[PDB]
Every structure is written in structure tokens, then in C-alpha cells.
Motif scaffolding. Structure first.
Motif, PDB file in Angstrom:
ATOM      1  N   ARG A   1       0.834  -1.188   0.000  1.00 35.48           N
ATOM      2  CA  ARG A   1       0.000   0.000   0.000  1.00 35.48           C
ATOM      3  C   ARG A   1       0.870   1.239   0.000  1.00 35.48           C
ATOM      4  NH1 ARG A   1      -2.905   2.104   4.478  1.00 35.48           N
ATOM      5  NH2 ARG A   1      -2.317   0.172   5.552  1.00 35.48           N
ATOM      6  N   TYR A   2       2.052   1.154   0.603  1.00 39.25           N
ATOM      7  CA  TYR A   2       2.934   2.302   0.705  1.00 39.25           C
ATOM      8  C   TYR A   2       3.825   2.389  -0.523  1.00 39.25           C
ATOM      9  CZ  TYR A   2       1.820   3.783   5.479  1.00 39.25           C
ATOM     10  OH  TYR A   2       1.192   4.290   6.596  1.00 39.25           O
TER      11      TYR A   2
ATOM     12  N   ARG B   1       2.383   1.427  -3.819  1.00 35.66           N
ATOM     13  CA  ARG B   1       1.509   2.024  -4.820  1.00 35.66           C
ATOM     14  C   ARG B   1       0.950   3.378  -4.383  1.00 35.66           C
ATOM     15  NH1 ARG B   1      -1.812  -1.666  -2.310  1.00 35.66           N
ATOM     16  NH2 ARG B   1      -3.732  -0.725  -1.501  1.00 35.66           N
ATOM     17  N   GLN B   2       0.981   3.721  -3.089  1.00 39.79           N
ATOM     18  CA  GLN B   2       0.750   5.109  -2.705  1.00 39.79           C
ATOM     19  C   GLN B   2       1.781   6.020  -3.353  1.00 39.79           C
ATOM     20  OE1 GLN B   2       0.031   6.554   1.671  1.00 39.79           O
ATOM     21  NE2 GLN B   2       1.973   7.436   0.970  1.00 39.79           N
TER      22      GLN B   2
ATOM     23  N   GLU C   1       1.232   6.164  -7.117  1.00 39.05           N
ATOM     24  CA  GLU C   1      -0.068   6.588  -7.626  1.00 39.05           C
ATOM     25  C   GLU C   1      -0.591   7.788  -6.852  1.00 39.05           C
ATOM     26  OE1 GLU C   1      -2.337   2.683  -8.990  1.00 39.05           O
ATOM     27  OE2 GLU C   1      -1.860   2.630  -6.847  1.00 39.05           O
ATOM     28  N   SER C   2       0.296   8.707  -6.478  1.00 40.67           N
ATOM     29  CA  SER C   2      -0.114   9.922  -5.790  1.00 40.67           C
ATOM     30  C   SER C   2       0.897  11.010  -6.100  1.00 40.67           C
ATOM     31  CB  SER C   2      -0.238   9.726  -4.273  1.00 40.67           C
ATOM     32  OG  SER C   2      -1.432  10.317  -3.792  1.00 40.67           O
TER      33      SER C   2
ATOM     34  N   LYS D   1       1.005  14.019  -4.258  1.00 39.26           N
ATOM     35  CA  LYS D   1       1.336  14.772  -3.062  1.00 39.26           C
ATOM     36  C   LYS D   1       2.488  14.149  -2.295  1.00 39.26           C
ATOM     37  CE  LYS D   1      -0.293  17.770  -2.991  1.00 39.26           C
ATOM     38  NZ  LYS D   1       1.050  18.413  -2.886  1.00 39.26           N
ATOM     39  N   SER D   2       2.713  12.850  -2.467  1.00 42.14           N
ATOM     40  CA  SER D   2       3.740  12.105  -1.746  1.00 42.14           C
ATOM     41  C   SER D   2       4.874  11.781  -2.715  1.00 42.14           C
ATOM     42  CB  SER D   2       3.153  10.840  -1.134  1.00 42.14           C
ATOM     43  OG  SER D   2       2.417  10.100  -2.095  1.00 42.14           O
TER      44      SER D   2
ATOM     45  N   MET E   1      25.158  14.940   8.212  1.00 41.07           N
ATOM     46  CA  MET E   1      24.951  14.723   6.785  1.00 41.07           C
ATOM     47  C   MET E   1      23.677  13.931   6.547  1.00 41.07           C
ATOM     48  SD  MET E   1      26.035  15.268   3.727  1.00 41.07           S
ATOM     49  CE  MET E   1      27.663  15.955   4.048  1.00 41.07           C
TER      50      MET E   1
ATOM     51  N   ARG F   1      15.362  16.127   2.291  1.00 37.00           N
ATOM     52  CA  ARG F   1      15.316  16.766   0.982  1.00 37.00           C
ATOM     53  C   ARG F   1      14.535  15.931  -0.027  1.00 37.00           C
ATOM     54  NH1 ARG F   1      20.864  18.726  -0.016  1.00 37.00           N
ATOM     55  NH2 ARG F   1      21.227  16.469  -0.087  1.00 37.00           N
TER      56      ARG F   1
ATOM     57  N   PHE G   1      11.125  10.396  10.350  1.00 37.89           N
ATOM     58  CA  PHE G   1      10.382   9.223   9.912  1.00 37.89           C
ATOM     59  C   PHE G   1       8.876   9.431   9.975  1.00 37.89           C
ATOM     60  CE2 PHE G   1      14.330   7.609  11.919  1.00 37.89           C
ATOM     61  CZ  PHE G   1      14.963   7.313  10.727  1.00 37.89           C
ATOM     62  N   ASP G   2       8.183   8.822   9.015  1.00 34.94           N
ATOM     63  CA  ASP G   2       6.735   8.933   8.905  1.00 34.94           C
ATOM     64  C   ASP G   2       6.010   7.797   9.603  1.00 34.94           C
ATOM     65  OD1 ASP G   2       7.616  10.931   7.272  1.00 34.94           O
ATOM     66  OD2 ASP G   2       6.564  10.249   5.469  1.00 34.94           O
ATOM     67  N   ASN G   3       6.652   6.639   9.739  1.00 32.93           N
ATOM     68  CA  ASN G   3       6.024   5.524  10.428  1.00 32.93           C
ATOM     69  C   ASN G   3       7.100   4.595  10.970  1.00 32.93           C
ATOM     70  OD1 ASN G   3       3.732   4.212  11.367  1.00 32.93           O
ATOM     71  ND2 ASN G   3       3.437   3.006   9.496  1.00 32.93           N
ATOM     72  N   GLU G   4       6.720   3.813  11.978  1.00 32.89           N
ATOM     73  CA  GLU G   4       7.622   2.917  12.689  1.00 32.89           C
ATOM     74  C   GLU G   4       6.955   1.550  12.774  1.00 32.89           C
ATOM     75  OE1 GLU G   4       9.187   4.731  16.249  1.00 32.89           O
ATOM     76  OE2 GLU G   4       8.303   6.685  15.763  1.00 32.89           O
TER      77      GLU G   4
ATOM     78  N   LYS H   1       1.392  15.672   9.802  1.00 37.17           N
ATOM     79  CA  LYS H   1       1.039  14.269   9.972  1.00 37.17           C
ATOM     80  C   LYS H   1      -0.415  14.038   9.601  1.00 37.17           C
ATOM     81  CE  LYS H   1       2.519  11.048  12.681  1.00 37.17           C
ATOM     82  NZ  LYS H   1       3.636  10.331  11.992  1.00 37.17           N
TER      83      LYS H   1
ATOM     84  N   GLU I   1      -4.050  11.292   3.433  1.00 39.96           N
ATOM     85  CA  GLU I   1      -3.572  10.806   2.142  1.00 39.96           C
ATOM     86  C   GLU I   1      -3.382   9.290   2.136  1.00 39.96           C
ATOM     87  OE1 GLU I   1      -3.620  11.708  -0.781  1.00 39.96           O
ATOM     88  OE2 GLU I   1      -1.715  12.315  -1.674  1.00 39.96           O
TER      89      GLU I   1
END
Lengths: 498, 253
Positions: free
Chosen positions: A284-285, A287-288, A291-292, A294-295, A386, A393, A422-425, B227, B233
Motif C-alpha cells: 500500500r505504501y 503504490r501510494q 499513484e499519488s 502529493k507524496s 549529513m 530533501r 520518519f513517517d512511520n515505525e 502528519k 492521504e
């Protein structure tokens, strides 16, 4: 003609850099403008820049271009270069023929500390003489200077102001239509000499790679007859020869298939639902991102204890995605390097990631890459800075990439306060029940069920509360199997491990 | 006009594209802050006593700070606007960074009106709390630069952003700044409902249900906008969007 996939840039260049030369000097005088004297070309190597320069020079029918390579005699050379243009200018005035000069690896002139460049004067002197020759009071109106570099950011802005290097152009990796055209151009003579079969029907290749592929196909065809013989006249290449040729040419800018496949997987087996949940979330992450709009930059943190399976999972998610560009940064790549070399390597990888519509990167065992030892504690802060900058970025010009990273030392990272990148863990737990052990035994064909049952029964009250990772269980089955008593040896090993 | 770009000017693309990917007025504080910014801008532009002004924007990480700074900057209409951020100084030695900062400051003093934005001050100095380790020369350069006044009846404005108020208080450079602004996180479900509406999440029938579920799942949540806008999204692309966004938002909360 002789260039493919680059029509738009050709139109732009012809419109601006050359079109004013075709007209008579009278009309250009009658308008009140002046010709452009600098053009900058940049892009990856082997893509067709010098090819364009030369083919353009044929249309205007200028003299064969002079060519120069950046890397007292040096001071004297530059004055030697322009002699013919000076002569022809004094000879014939505004009607003199056009003179075209090519300059390669321009950035090398600037790629030195200012102090050394000026003190030695080698870097600065050529530059000053060159600018003097096209901007100053000794201006020569017959010359055009083409520069070429793989890195635009190192050239000083003084050069880019009007009157000097006014127009700048970028070259890209070709698309499918370009490659189809190149296929036609490359197979023209085969096709038109009846040396190409009727079954041949014409991802990230360049032109040279297509040439090499055609040559390899010819090699297959030529080899099948040698060992020089009768009936050379029946030679024809065939689809199968091309499909065999595909296995001999491997492209740059691609997938590091062997490392992920062999090194990172020596089994994969779905002993519980949590693994399925993780794999679903990954598709899902994937094809997100695919197929998006915004991301265009995702970051994730696959965390869990050491020995749990992390990397094999990451690779497994990576292989199923099918992206053209995939890579991984792990300690093995950096062994034996100095710190600055490591930084340069990381940065170059990041540069390489910024030239495709889609990209994936995998980072393994971050706390090891930073040289963490908790006794001191000791660690290199520069690499940490670094990485912390690079982890946010976003790629340029509507591209997108996905980053997966793995770690077993969550508290240390927490204590370094870099958890905002990080966005998810994700958490990967060990095994703690005998049903899991039953699954592993069944999946690995340890022995017939009766013994598996006896082992489980024995462990039921020998040690009911075990807690062990997959690696040790899969190295305990292997040693028990090649033993006299595999059920008492496996029981002993397992109870010791527990 | 779209083919010739001048030297000296506005770095339009960086401010516009990088720093703003949404702006929605979900509370009164945001309106108030923007009004204060406009006040200060036209103060600088319409007074001869105020020829150097410095501001501090602070709040938790991910709060919205930088996007606000950019929003205040773009609306100002000054001829000269620039920003200093870590992305520009990456890969340099300390001397190169200091020289670059100095050149920027010199270039700021050559127009009637000027704006400068400094982002993430604690990272420019290379702060890490385990040592602690940081560069003091850059610190002193910045400290001196924030009090010097432009020459010959010119004027400029400075806006700086930070998440490490305690550290700056310890380092004793708060006297450079004239005022401090605080930015909070979201804390009500009404704001979340607004965000869902603003992002056309789904028809009201389902939109209501997630609120009704959060009503007694987690009524006291605390999450930033970024978030939430990445959870809408991802949940949108799920097969069970309501249960995915509620589980994910409960986890975040």
C-alpha cells in the motif's frame, strides 16, 4: 541528422544559438542586435553532447571545431588557440567564416581552493584570458565557445551573467520513443541488406548500450556458423539471439539484484498474520508513492531486535515493487574508507537517486554506520549531520523516491532526537509460542510428524515459556538434523537457548 | 520576460515552492499572527526610527513555523528578500560557511528595503546534546550580525526560527531579538473536521462516524498538521478508509 530522442532541445538551440547567423549581416545590422557568444551544456556522460556540437557544426558549414581539455606553457597555449580566428577576422571582417571552439570538463578549472588557484595562477589566468577574448576590448566576433560539464553548481555566477554563457541546457536519459528510433537507426543496414529476420519486433538504456546489444546479437549469429565455411549467404539474426544478448549487457543506473536476492534472502516463510499485515502495508505504501502526486518523498523506520528478520523483509518488499532504480547503503559498501570518502560516496549515491522518475533506497543498520560504542560513548557527528539533512530533501522536477531504514537501537536514536525524520515505525517481535516452532519445523521438513510431536510434547513441560529469534532456531534444526539423536540434541540445544 | 532572469532580485522559487504546501486558517491565532507580521512589515516600511528589526518565531517541531514565515515574507512586497538555511551550507568547511553568511549580510545593505529569513538556527551551529558539541565561531558571528544596523538610512527586517528555546536561553543570545512568537499544535476535533472538509475526505455520512468514534476513543489528542495531512492521504488509499484513519490517528494521538 544522426541524433535521436533530442528534438526539442535541438529546436531550442537552433532557434537561439545559431539562427541569427544564417541571415545576412545586413539585416542583423538593420535590427540592432548582436550574436550570442556562450552556451553551456550539462548532463551525464555518454549521452550525446559532443555529438550535437559536431553535427550542428556541419549545418552552418563552419570549420572543423577545435577541441580542448581542461585538465608558463599553459599561459602561452591560450593565445595560440585563437590565432586562426584573429587572422580570418583581420582578413575578411564581418564576412569571415565561423569558428567553433569546444571546451570539456570546464568545472575542473574552478575545482580548487581559491587561494591555490590565484597563487599558482593556472586556474585564474586561463579564465581571465578567455573572458578577455569574448567580452573585453579585443573582442573577436567570429568565435563561439561551447562549454561542457557534469556539474553546473561549481561554475561561478560571474560567468553566467549576460555576455558570458547566457544560455544553458540540460541533457536527459532517453525515453522509449527515443530508443525505438535508435533501434531503427542502428538496424537500418541489417534491415536493408536482408540480414535481419522477420520475427524481430523493435528500460533505461543509452545509445551505446543499444549498439553493444546489436553487436552481441551479431556475435551470437556469427558464432553459430564458424568452425571458414560454405553458405555464408544464409546468415540472418533472430529474436532468440537478441533475447540471449539481453543476458550479457547489464546497464548502469539499475537494480543491484544479486546483493538483495542472494545476500538478503535465504528463506521467507509466513508463520503468522503480522508478517502478512506488514507486507500488505508495504504494497500500500509502494503504490501510494506510485499513484499519488502529493507524496514524492516517504521515509520509514523498520525497527526491532537484532536477529529478527528485518533486512530480509525490507528486501522482500523491495523486490516485489518493480521500480527501475533500487539501491542499498549498508556497512559492507563503506569498509576501508576514510570519513570524507564515505561522505562523498553517500552524496554521490544521493545525486544518482535524483535523475529518475522513481527511486528506492534501503539503509541498513544505521547505528553501526555511525560507529556507536556505548562505553565512551563514541560516534562521528559529521556523518550524523549529513544523514539528518539528507533524510528530508525531496527530489527535483516532479520525481519521487522511497526510503526504508532499519535499526535495533531505538532508544539511542530517540536519545539523539532524530525521530522527526520518519513517517512511520514498525516493530518486529521474536517467537514465544510452540505453535510457531511447529510451523517452522513443518516448513523446514525436519522429520516425520511423530518425532515433531515428541519434541513438542517434551518441550511442553521442559520449557514452556521460551523466547528466541528465527536465526538460532534455523541453525539449531540444521545441527540437530546431522546428529545421531536429532530429538534429544534439538531439545537440549533449544532448552539451552531458552 | 520568462527567458531572461536578472541578478539581484527575489529567490522566488525557493520561498514559494519549498516552504508552502498548504495554508488554512483553522484557528484565530493564525490570523492574529499574520496580522502582527503585517503590522511589523509596514512599521519598518513607514518609519525612520525603526531601521533594524529582528523577530523570533518559536514552537514545537512540525508546527508550521517555516510555512508561516514564508507566508509573511511573500506578502511583504519588498524588493530584496532572501533566506539562509542548512541546505545552502551543506558540505562546507566552517570558514566557507562563515564567509557565505558574511557575504549575504553585505549584500543585504544595498537596497532601501530588505528581508532575511533564518531557518533552524540550532542546526546551523551543529548542536548535539550528548557532548554537547557545537561551533562557537559561527555563534559569535551570528550574535554580532544581529545587532549591526544598515548604513545610510536603509532598513531591513530579520525573522529567525527555532525549536530549542532552552538551548538559546542557555547560550545567552536572546538579547539580539526584539520579540518572540509562540505556535501551538492542534488540540480539538472541530479542527480535524474542518481539515477533513477542506480536503474533501468523503461524504458527510462517513466523515461524521470517525468523529463519533474519536469522541470516546481519544478526546484529548495532540497532533500537528503535516502528519494529519499525510494520514488522510494514506487512509484515502486504503480499502477501509474510516477504520484505517481512525486506527492510525489513535496511534498518532
Amino acid at each position: 541528422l544522426g541524433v535521436g530522442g533530442l528534438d526539442k532541445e535541438f529546436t531550442k538551440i537552433f532557434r537561439r544559438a545559431f539562427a541569427s547567423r544564417i541571415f545576412p549581416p545586413s539585416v542583423i545590422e538593420k535590427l540592432g542586435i548582436s550574436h550570442v557568444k556562450g552556451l553551456l551544456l550539462y548532463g551525464p556522460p555518454g549521452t550525446g553532447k559532443t555529438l550535437i556540437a559536431r553535427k550542428i557544426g556541419t549545418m552552418l558549414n563552419a570549420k572543423e571545431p577545435k577541441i580542448v581539455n581542461g585538465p608558463g606553457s599553459s599561459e602561452e597555449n591560450i593565445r595560440n588557440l585563437f590565432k586562426d580566428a584573429e587572422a580570418e577576422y583581420r582578413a575578411k571582417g564581418e564576412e569571415s567564416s565561423l569558428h567553433i571552439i569546444i571546451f570539456d570538463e570546464l568545472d575542473s578549472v574552478f575545482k580548487q581552493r581559491g587561494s591555490r588557484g590565484d597563487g599558482t595562477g593556472v586556474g585564474d589566468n586561463v579564465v581571465n584570458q578567455l573572458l578577455a577574448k569574448m567580452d573585453g576590448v579585443d573582442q573577436l566576433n567570429n568565435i563561439l565557445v561551447i562549454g561542457m560539464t557534469n556539474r553546473k553548481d561549481l561554475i561561478d555566477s560571474a560567468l553566467l551573467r549576460p555576455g558570458r554563457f547566457e544560455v544553458q541546457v540540460e541533457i536527459h536519459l532517453p525515453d522509449e520513443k527515443g530508443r525505438l528510433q535508435i533501434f531503427d537507426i542502428q538496424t537500418k543496414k541489417m534491415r536493408e541488406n536482408n540480414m535481419m529476420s522477420d520475427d524481430v519486433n523493435l528500460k533505461n538504456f543509452s545509445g551505446a548500450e543499444i549498439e553493444g546489444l546489436v553487436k552481441s546479437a551479431s556475435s551470437f549469429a556469427i558464432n553459430k556458423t564458424v568452425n571458414n565455411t560454405k553458405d555464408i549467404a544464409k546468415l540472418k539474426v533472430t529474436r532468440e539471439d537478441f533475447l540471449n544478448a539481453l543476458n550479457d549487457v547489464t546497464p548502469a543506473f539499475g537494480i543491484s539484484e544479486e546483493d538483495l536476492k542472494t545476500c538478503v534472502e535465504g528463506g521467507m516463510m509466513l508463520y503468522s498474520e503480522r508478517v502478512n499485515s506488514i507486507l500488505k502495508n508495504g504494497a500500500r505504501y509502494v503504490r501510494q508513492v506510485r499513484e499519488s502526486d502529493k507524496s514524492r518523498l516517504v521515509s520509514l523506520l523498520i525497527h526491532g531486535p537484532a536477529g529478527s528478520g528485518k533486512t530480509a523483509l525490507a528486501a522482500e518488499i523491495a523486490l516485489k515493487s518493480g521500480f527501475p532504480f533500487i539501491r542499498l547503503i549498508s556497512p559492507n559498501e563503506l569498509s576501508g574508507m576514510s570519513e570524507s570518502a564515505k561522505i562523498a560516496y553517500i552524496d554521490n549515491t544521493f545525486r544518482d537517486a535524483y535523475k529518475s522518475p522513481l527511486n528506492i533506497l534501503v539503509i541498513d543498520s544505521l547505528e553501526t554506520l555511525v560507529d556507536w560504542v556505548p562505553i565512551g560513548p563514541r560516534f562521528s557527528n559529521n556523518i550524523l549531520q549529513m544523514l539528518k539533512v539528507a533524510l528530508k530533501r525531496k527530489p527535483p522536477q516532479d520525481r519521487r523516491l522511497l526510503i526504508m531504514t532499519t535499526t535495533s537501537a531505538y532508544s539511542v536514536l530517540q536519545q539523539m532526537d532524530i525521530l522527526s525524520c520518519f513517517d512511520n515505525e514498525i516493530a518486529v517481535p521474536n517467537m514465544t509460542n510452540l505453535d510457531e516452532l511447529n510451523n517452522v519445523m513443518i516448513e523446514s521438513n525436519f522429520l516425520d510428524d511423530a518425532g515433531r510431536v515428541k519434541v513438542i510434547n517434551e518441550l511442553s513441560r521442559s520449557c514452556p515459556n521460551f523466547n528466541v529469534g528465527i536465526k538460532k532456531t534455523l541453525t539449531n534444526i540444521e545441527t540437530a538434523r546431522h546428529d545421531e539423536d536429532p530429538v534429544n540434541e534439538l531439545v537440549e540445544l533449544m532448552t539451552q537457548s531458552a
